[PDB]
C-alpha cells in the first residue's frame, strides 16, 4: 500500500483544515492545479496501516485524487513545497 | 429528494454523534459505518451483524483510523465523501424499492461508494465490501401492493393479451390509479351498449379535451363491478395502442400482417374488450385519405363483437364510420361526452395542488387555485377550463418563491458577502499572499458555516410559501400571457391607453372599459373580449388604440393583427360580364385573416375600414361575436372568445370629417358629434347589417385632433425620435414649442394621428440632419429644436 | 501557431546557444538535443535523463558527429531538420493538449524528427528513439480543467 498519495484538496481553506493538526512527520506538498490545490502527501517511513490511518484524516478534510504525481512534476504549479501545511497552518489560518 | 424514509436518517444521524463522540471536525466515512450498524436492525445495521461486524468490531478499527480527537468537531456537517454515498443512496433506491430511502440503500449506496474509511473498516475486519452490498440486498422483497404472487389462474386466455398492451384493470390491482374527477356520463352510456351481441360496441364521441383516458379509468372500474349484463361478465379488458404496433417496424405491410394476427386472436370474444383509442386512423373512410385502411379487417372485427370495442373518436371522426356500413354502421353507436365542469375544474386542481410538495410552494391556497379556473376563461381563453389554471397555480408556485431571492427575509445579502469573499481569497491563495489569502479566506469561512446555518433558515420560504399559490400570483401568470399584473391593467386601464393614445382621449376611456367589463368577467365566454366599430377620420387614435391594448393589456406593445376589409371589399367590385372573379371572402374566411389572429390566440385584431365591405364579412365576425369561435381552416374552432376585435370604419365619413373640435369651439365639437354620431352610425349601420352592430358591443366614434389630442401625441413621437438617438448617443429635443408646430399638420377633419408620423420625420428628422451634417449641432450636446419666428430654429445647448 | 508555451521556445534558444558553443553555421539536430537535455527538468529534458542522456553523455556524441567549427555561425536559424522537429512538436501538443506548446511535444517532435544529428546521438548512446518518446509521455498524466476522476454518485438517472 503507497505510502505516498496525491490528492487533490478543493477550497484553499480545506489544506488549511487539513493542516491545524496534520503534518505527522510527512512532507506534504501544495500545488494549486486546476486552480484547487493538490497536495502531494508522502507518508516517510509510516506502514501500510499507518498511511491509511494518517490518510483518513487528510481525507475528512479532502479526497484523494486519481492523478499520478508526474503529472504534478512537469506542469504542476506550487503554493507551499514540502512543508505544505505546516507553513499554510501559520501563514493561512491565523 | 421527494423525501425519505426515517432509516435513512436515523443511520445518519448517528453518524453526526460518532463524529463529535470521537472527535470529528466533518463527520467522515467512519462514522456512517458506526451509524449503519448503531442503527441495529436497519437493512444496513442488520447486514452489517450478518457480516460480523458489530458497532463494536467497526468502532476498534475507526478509533485506529481517525477517531481522536477533533472533539470540537468544527463544522459538523459531513464529509463530501459522506454526502456522495447519500447522494448515490438515494437513486438506488429509486432503483431498490424506496422512492422515500431508507437504510438499506444506505450500505448498498456505501458499498457503490466504496471509500476512505468507511471502506478500510470493512475490508480491516474481514469483510468484502460486496459481501456487504450482498448482505443488505438479499433482505429485500415486494413492496408492490397487490403483488407478491405465488397464484396461478386461467387458460385460454394466454395466446391473446400478450402482444399488445396496456391493461387499466391490472395497474387498479396493484391500484396506482387514481380515478381522477369525472366525466362521468360516458361511463353509463358504455355498458349498455356493450353487453350487446349483434353490434357490441360503444363509442364515445367528442372533447378531447378532458384526457380521454381518464374516462377510460371509469370504464375499466364499471366493467369490473358489478352491475353488468351477463355478457359482459367473464370479461377481460384489452387496451389496444398503436405505438406497440408501429414501435421497432418501418413498413405498412408488417404492421398489418400484426394486425390482422391480433384481430384473429381476438377470438376470445364474448369475454373479450377491446379499448380502441384513435379509431378512426384505421378506419381509414372517406375525405382524401382517413389514415391507414385497417378498415378492411377492422370493420368485420367491430362487427363480429370479437373485437367488440370501445372507440374513443372526435368531433368530425364519427362522419368516418357512420359513412361506411354494415361494419362501420353496425359497429359504431355514439354516446354523449361530459367533463368535470368549471367549478369541478377548480377540485381537481386542489387535489394534485398538495401533490407539488416535491415543489412546495402550493399546496393551497384554495381562492387562488378558484382564481386559477375562473380568470382563464377569458384570460387567454381558448384550452380547457383546469388545464388554463395548473399553470397559473405552479407558475404562481414559484413566484413567490423568486421573490425569497430578494426580499423577504433576503438573508441572501449573507450569500452575497461570502461570494465575494471566496474570490478575495482566492485571488490571493493564487498570488499568495499568504496571510492575505488566509483573513479573505477567514471572512469566506466565517461566511460559509453562517451561510450553511441560514440556508436553514431558508426553510422559512418553505414555511412561506407551501401554503399559497396567492391568487394575486396566479392572476398574474395569466396576465403574463393574457389581482397582481392583471387588476393595475384592469383598473387602470383607461390611463395606460391613454398613455399610447392621446387621438381621442373620449375613446380611450370608452375602450378602456369595455375590455375591462370583459376581462373583469361579466361577458359570455363565448364573445371576445371587445367588439367595436371605430369611427372616426381614421387613425384619429384608432390605429394606435389597438396598439395601446396591445400594450396595456400583455405587456407587449404589439400583440395585434391588422387586416384591411376594403381589399376584402365584394361590395363595389368583384367581377364583371366575361371577366375573371376574385376570391375575396375566400380568402378571409378560408384562411388567411383566421390563420394570423390563431398565432397570438389574444390579440387586438384591427380590422380596417369595414363598412367598404359587404355585409357578408359581417356575418364572420358576426360568429365571433355569437360563438367566440370562428370556424375555419381544417376544421378548427380558434376561439374568439379570447381576442379583442376592433374593427374601423367612416361610411358617414363627411360627418366624421366634420367632427368634434374643440379649436372650432366646444359647441362645434358637441355639435358635429351629434351629428356623426348618427348619420354615421346609419352609414356605418348601412354598411353593416343592425344585427351585425347587435353583437357588436360598443360603436366608438373617434374625432380629428380637437385641438388639444395632437400635441401630445406629437410629443411622444416627437420624444420618441428624440430617444431613439440618445441610445446611441445623440441628444435631441423639440421643444414644446416645436412639438407644438409638428402636431399641426393634424388638424385636419380629414386626417387622424396618422399624418404626425410625417410631421416628425419632416421637422425633427430631416430638419436636424441637415444641421447635423453641416454642423450646426452634434453627438451628444444638445440640440434644441425650437420656435423663435413661427418657424423652427435649431439652437445648441450643452 | 495558436501562440506556444514557453518550454518549447526554452528547449529551442539553446539549440542556438549550442550553434555557436561548437560552431554551426545553421544549428543542427545535434544542438537542439543538447538543447533539450541543458533545459533540464522540462518534460523533453526530464525525458532525456531518465534513459540516462545527460547533457554531458549526449554532447560527447554531439561534437564527434559535427561539433566543430563553423564557429562563424551562418546566418544562425535552424537546419531544415531542426524546422521539422518544431512543425512536429506543434503537433505532438495537439496530441498532448497544449494549444499552446511545450517541452514532452518537442522531445516526442524530436523522435518522429528521428532523421536528425540528435536521433543518432541518442541510438549511439544505447537509447531507443522512442524508449524516449516514450519517457517523454510518462511525465504527464492529465492537465484537465475541472475533472479527475474517481467517486461519483446517482444511479437511477442511468437509463435516460
Not at chain 2, 126 to 152: C, D, F, I, M, P
Not at chain 2, 713 to 718: E, G, K, N, W
Request: aromatic residues 6%; glycine residues 6%; negative net charge.
Amino acid at each position: 500500500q503507497k505510502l505516498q498519495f496525491v490528492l487533490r484538496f478543493g477550497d484553499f481553506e480545506d489544506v488549511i483544515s487539513l493542516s491545524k493538526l496534520n503534518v505527522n512527520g510527512s512532507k506534504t506538498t501544495l500545488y494549486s492545479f486546476e486552480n484547487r490545490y493538490y497536495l502531494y502527501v508522502d507518508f516517510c517511513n509510516m506502514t501500510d496501516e499507518e498511511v491509511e490511518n494518517q490518510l483518513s484524516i487528510l481525507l475528512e478534510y479532502a479526497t484523494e485524487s486519481s492523478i499520478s504525481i508526474h503529472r504534478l512534476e512537469e506542469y504542476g504549479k506550487l503554493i507551499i513545497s514540502e512543508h505544505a501545511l505546516e507553513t499554510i497552518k501559520k501563514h493561512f489560518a491565523s | 429528494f421527494g423525501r425519505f424514509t426515517e432509516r435513512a436518517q436515523k443511520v445518519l444521524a448517528l453518524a453526526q454523534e460518532e463524529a463529535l463522540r470521537l472527535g470529528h471536525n466533518n463527520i467522515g466515512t467512519e462514522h456512517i459505518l458506526l451509524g449503519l450498524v448503531r442503527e441495529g436492525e436497519g437493512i444496513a445495521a442488520k447486514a452489517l451483524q450478518a457480516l460480523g461486524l458489530g458497532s463494536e468490531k467497526i468502532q476498534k478499527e475507526v478509533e485506529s483510523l481517525i477517531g481522536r480527537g477533533q472533539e470540537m468537531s468544527q463544522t459538523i456537517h459531513y464529509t463530501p465523501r459522506a454526502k456522495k454515498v447519500i447522494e448515490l443512496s438515494m437513486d438506488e433506491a429509486r432503483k431498490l424499492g424506496h422512492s422515500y430511502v431508507g437504510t438499506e440503500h444506505i450500505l448498498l449506496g456505501l458499498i457503490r461508494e466504496g471509500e476512505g474509511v468507511a471502506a478500510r473498516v470493512l475490508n480491516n475486519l474481514g469483510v468484502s465490501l460486496n459481501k456487504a452490498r450482498q448482505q443488505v440486498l438479499q433482505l429485500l422483497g415486494s413492496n408492490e401492493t397487490g403483488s407478491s404472487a405465488a397464484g396461478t389462474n386461467s387458460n385460454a386466455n394466454t395466446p391473446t393479451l400478450d402482444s399488445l398492451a396496456r391493461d387499466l384493470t391490472a395497474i387498479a390491482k396493484e391500484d396506482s390509479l387514481d380515478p381522477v374527477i369525472g366525466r362521468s356520463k360516458e361511463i353509463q352510456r358504455v355498458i349498455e351498449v356493450l353487453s350487446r351481441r349483434t353490434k357490441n360496441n360503444p363509442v364515445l364521441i367528442g372533447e378531447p379535451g378532458v384526457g380521454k383516458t381518464a374516462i377510460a379509468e371509469g370504464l375499466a372500474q364499471q366493467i369490473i363491478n358489478n352491475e353488468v349484463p351477463e355478457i359482459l361478465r367473464d370479461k377481460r379488458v384489452m387496451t389496444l395502442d398503436m405505438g406497440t404496433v408501429v414501435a421497432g417496424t418501418k413498413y405498412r405491410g408488417e404492421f398489418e400482417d400484426r394486425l390482422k394476427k391480433v384481430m384473429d386472436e381476438i377470438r376470445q370474444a364474448g369475454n373479450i374488450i377491446l379499448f380502441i383509442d384513435e379509431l378512426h386512423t384505421l378506419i381509414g373512410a372517406g375525405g382524401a385519405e382517413g389514415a391507414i385502411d385497417a378498415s378492411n379487417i377492422l370493420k368485420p372485427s367491430l362487427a363480429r363483437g370479437e373485437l367488440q370495442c370501445i372507440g374513443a373518436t372526435t368531433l368530425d371522426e364519427y362522419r368516418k364510420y357512420i359513412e361506411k356500413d354494415a361494419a362501420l354502421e353496425r359497429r359504431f353507436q355514439p354516446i354523449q361526452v361530459d367533463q368535470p365542469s368549471v367549478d369541478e375544474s377548480i377540485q381537481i386542481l386542489q387535489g394534485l395542488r398538495d401533490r407539488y410538495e416535491a415543489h412546495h410552494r402550493v399546496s393551497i391556497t384554495d381562492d387562488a387555485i378558484e382564481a386559477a379556473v375562473k380568470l382563464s376563461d377569458r384570460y387567454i381563453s381558448d384550452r380547457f377550463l383546469p388545464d388554463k389554471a395548473i399553470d397559473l397555480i405552479d407558475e404562481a408556485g414559484s413566484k413567490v418563491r423568486l421573490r425569497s431571492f430578494t426580499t423577504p427575509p433576503n438573508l441572501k445579502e449573507l450569500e452575497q458577502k461570502l461570494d465575494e469573499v471566496r474570490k478575495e481569497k482566492d485571488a490571493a491563495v493564487q498570488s499568495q499572499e499568504f496571510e492575505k489569502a488566509a483573513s479573505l479566506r477567514d471572512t469566506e469561512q466565517r461566511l460559509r458555516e453562517q451561510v450553511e446555518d441560514t440556508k436553514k433558515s431558508w426553510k422559512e420560504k418553505q414555511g412561506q410559501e407551501n401554503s399559497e399559490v396567492t391568487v394575486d400570483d396566479i392572476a398574474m401568470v395569466v396576465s403574463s400571457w393574457t389581482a397582481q399584473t392583471e387588476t393595475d391593467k384592469l383598473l387602470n386601464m383607461e390611463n395606460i391607453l391613454h398613455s399610447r393614445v392621446i387621438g381621442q382621449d373620449e375613446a380611450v376611456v370608452a375602450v378602456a372599459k369595455a375590455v375591462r367589463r370583459a376581462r373583469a368577467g361579466l361577458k359570455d365566454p363565448k364573445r371576445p373580449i371587445g367588439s367595436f366599430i371605430f369611427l372616426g377620420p381614421t387613425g384619429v387614435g384608432k390605429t394606435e388604440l389597438a396598439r395601446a391594448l396591445a400594450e396595456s393589456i400583455f405587456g407587449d406593445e404589439e400583440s395585434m393583427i391588422r387586416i384591411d376589409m376594403s381589399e376584402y371589399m365584394e361590395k363595389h367590385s368583384t367581377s364583371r360580364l366575361v371577366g375573371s372573379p376574385p376570391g375575396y371572402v375566400g380568402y378571409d374566411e378560408g384562411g388567411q385573416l383566421t390563420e394570423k389572429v390563431r398565432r397570438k390566440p389574444y390579440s387586438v385584431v384591427l380590422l380596417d375600414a369595414i363598412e367598404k365591405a359587404h355585409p357578408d364579412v359581417f356575418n364572420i365576425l358576426l360568429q365571433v361575436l355569437e360563438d367566440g369561435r370562428l370556424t375555419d381552416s381544417k376544421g378548427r374552432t380558434v376561439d374568439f372568445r379570447n381576442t379583442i376585435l376592433i374593427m374601423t370604419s367612416n361610411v358617414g365619413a363627411s360627418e366624421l370629417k366634420r367632427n368634434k373640435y374643440v379649436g372650432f369651439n366646444v359647441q362645434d365639437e358637441t355639435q358635429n358629434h351629434k351629428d356623426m354620431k348618427d348619420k354615421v352610425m346609419g352609414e356605418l349601420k348601412r354598411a353593416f347589417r343592425p344585427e351585425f352592430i347587435n353583437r357588436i358591443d360598443e360603436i366608438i366614434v373617434f374625432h380629428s385632433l380637437e385641438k388639444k389630442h395632437l400635441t401630445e401625441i406629437v410629443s411622444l413621437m416627437s420624444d420618441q425620435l428624440t430617444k431613439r438617438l440618445k441610445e446611441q448617443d445623440l441628444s435631441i429635443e423639440l421643444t414644446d414649442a416645436a412639438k407644438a408646430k409638428v402636431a399641426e399638420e393634424g388638424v385636419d377633419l380629414e386626417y387622424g394621428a396618422r399624418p404626425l408620423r410625417r410631421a416628425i420625420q419632416k421637422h425633427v428628422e430631416d430638419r436636424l440632419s441637415e444641421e447635423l451634417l453641416r454642423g450646426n449641432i452634434h453627438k451628444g450636446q444638445h440640440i434644441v429644436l425650437d420656435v423663435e419666428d413661427g418657424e423652427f430654429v435649431v439652437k445648441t445647448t450643452a
